[PDB]
Design a protein around this ligand. Sequence first.
Ligand SMILES: CNc1nc2c(CC[C@H]3O[C@@H](OC)[C@@H]4OC(C)(C)O[C@@H]43)c3nc(N)[nH]c(=O)c3cc2[nH]1
Ligand SMILES: CNc1nc2c(CC[C@H]3O[C@@H](OC)[C@@H]4OC(C)(C)O[C@@H]43)c3nc(N)[nH]c(=O)c3cc2[nH]1
Ligand SMILES: [Zn+2]
Ligand SMILES: [Zn+2]
Lengths: 365, 364
Amino acid sequence: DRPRFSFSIAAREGKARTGTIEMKRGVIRTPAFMPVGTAATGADIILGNTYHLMLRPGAERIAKLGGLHSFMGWDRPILTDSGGYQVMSLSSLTKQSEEGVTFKSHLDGSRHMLSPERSIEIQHLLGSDIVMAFDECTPYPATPSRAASSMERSMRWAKRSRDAFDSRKEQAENAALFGIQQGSVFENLRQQSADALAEIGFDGYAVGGLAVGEGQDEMFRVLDFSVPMLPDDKPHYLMGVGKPDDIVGAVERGIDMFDCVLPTRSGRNGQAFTWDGPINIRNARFSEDLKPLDSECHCAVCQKWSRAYIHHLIRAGEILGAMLMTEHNIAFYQQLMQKIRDSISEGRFSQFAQDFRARYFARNS
Amino acid sequence: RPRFSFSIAAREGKARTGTIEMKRGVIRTPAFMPVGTAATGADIILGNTYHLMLRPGAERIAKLGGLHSFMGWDRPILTDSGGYQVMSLSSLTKQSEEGVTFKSHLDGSRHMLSPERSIEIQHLLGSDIVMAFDECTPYPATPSRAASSMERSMRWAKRSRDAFDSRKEQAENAALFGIQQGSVFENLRQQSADALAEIGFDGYAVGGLAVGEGQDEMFRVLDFSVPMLPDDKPHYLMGVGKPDDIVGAVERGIDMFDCVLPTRSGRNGQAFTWDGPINIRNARFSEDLKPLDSECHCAVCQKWSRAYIHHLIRAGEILGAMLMTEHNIAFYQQLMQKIRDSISEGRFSQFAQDFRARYFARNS
Ligand SMILES: CNc1nc2c(CC[C@H]3O[C@@H](OC)[C@@H]4OC(C)(C)O[C@@H]43)c3nc(N)[nH]c(=O)c3cc2[nH]1
Ligand SMILES: CNc1nc2c(CC[C@H]3O[C@@H](OC)[C@@H]4OC(C)(C)O[C@@H]43)c3nc(N)[nH]c(=O)c3cc2[nH]1
Ligand SMILES: [Zn+2]
Ligand SMILES: [Zn+2]
């Protein structure tokens, strides 16, 4: 049968790689974009907001309903985060210590807590295939003192995540665990986090603490030295990235996995991604543009709907407009990953990145 | 249960409270009718006919069991006719006496709306209350533009009546509402009302409002338009509205409401409270341990504080807007219940004064 977790590289070019991740529920073609999973009403894997799901409707409720695969109507692999991002983005509502993170008690007495052990337990109840270690996304900007103490605490939490993950045979035999590298924008702290994660051992290694307002120039600079610190024979996950040009540049620096809310956030805010850069469909230039959102896109929206139709739908307050924008953006992101995977296999990825950026920045939509 | 039976239990001024009895349940009036969604306290929900015929299509919904199966909702459902999209999407339409033809899509598909096709689609959706195919006259409109538009809509209202009665299954189990037009002009409103009464309908909706006219102008049109409709029939104000808009509209004879603001506000960081709307994104709520509203009985206010929702939206968690949306919908139903209670008690005039006094002071 299919293996638990097997990462093989089929072709390389520079620091970029293309290949597959084999799991019991399907194959993940890398470099991969992993869209946000939703409740049931082309991607290889979807994600679940662990913090969101544990509050609504609850990890135990999800488990009794059959798991996220039953909850989201998705039989392919699923990855869940650990909540370490919400440890930072919601720090004002948290009491934090070495044991874990305790959130402010609710008006009904209910109180939620996150720890390396509880996070893995929740991710097991959700039935996810790829588990993220409980970490802390260090805020940006952060002093070298604040970044060091946070990264060091996160590495202590990473070891407890490893132990808690291995404490369940059912989870350790069917799922995979990813360590998350921290260190903010500092090379030395990044090397300490990578060394700590490798000594513990993980099926995959994620680069955390980025996509928090640092800018692409700073993000690329951190990727330049951070990704070579991770085990080459293991997949590399850049959390929170990103824009199409962010993804292309990140693949050029050794990243194999991506997640981002921009396709949905842009689709709900009137922005569509095209090969000629992003477009604001609300602009009057599209009032009578009879072309689809993107001339090359093969998604269902571009085969039927014009820019003019979508422009007037959003102007008229029809939520169908944002759904088509969202539907296009998600499919466009998968088409970007496919073109990236193709170009690495052909040995023409460096040419693709140049041609992509040239046309994506000219904005000749 | 009867097909459609509207009875008034208590009156005060032009305001009324009562029930609408249908084969699938009872609708307590004055009623707010939230926007129905696909399955994942209101008496009736609505379905965007124009949206549903495009996604996933009226025929697909019919084969799935109808909107009651589609939305997991066994209670009554009301569907609009598309007459609003005739105006809001007029740039993509070719309009004539026969109906409205939308611009052909990139796959050759073309959609058309007419009094006959609209009623057929609403039958395919399996809705319990059908709206006549009309045209929401744009605002502002010249008296010439409003007259031709209203008269066209009344010819469409008659064809809607005939098409509705052409199906025994629909005519014996559903209801048809006529829609009054005339923009902001009294004489044109009287012609539309007279025309709709000569045709005959189970209910009468006040259309062509909530299109940017302002509350003062909207109330002024309601002052003379609602008394033109049959008193023994329900009155539906389409698109209204804000909480104070609803209270003022009930004061002028409206029994039914629909509005996207509870969802539009919940997604844009605005929550409705008895002390007026609040912008949860303001820093004053960063540590406000109180719920969104002190009196609200919804699930969100029993568990979540203003501080928690404020930080969720600030952190980009979509759960924040869901709680805001859930509260706004439940708050709207609590407003209708308090209105229905006060009419039954004979103290509605006092409620309207007390509501506006506290709602506009903004002492949240
Ligand atoms: C956007 N920038 C960005 N995302 C990051 C994440 C993922 C956190 C997001 O995963 C989403 O669910 C799948 C949730 O939806 C939003 C609201 C986007 O937040 C959650 C991170 N996760 C962990 N564990 N650790 C990190 O250092 C980290 C850094 C990030 N930077
Ligand atoms: C907000 N103001 C407003 N709404 C009105 C409507 C309902 C049309 C809306 O009903 C909603 O679905 C249930 C949809 O939400 C949006 C997207 C707002 O549009 C649909 C009207 N409908 C008809 N048939 N005729 C009218 O004269 C009319 C006037 C309106 N003024
Ligand atoms: Zn597309
Ligand atoms: Zn509430």
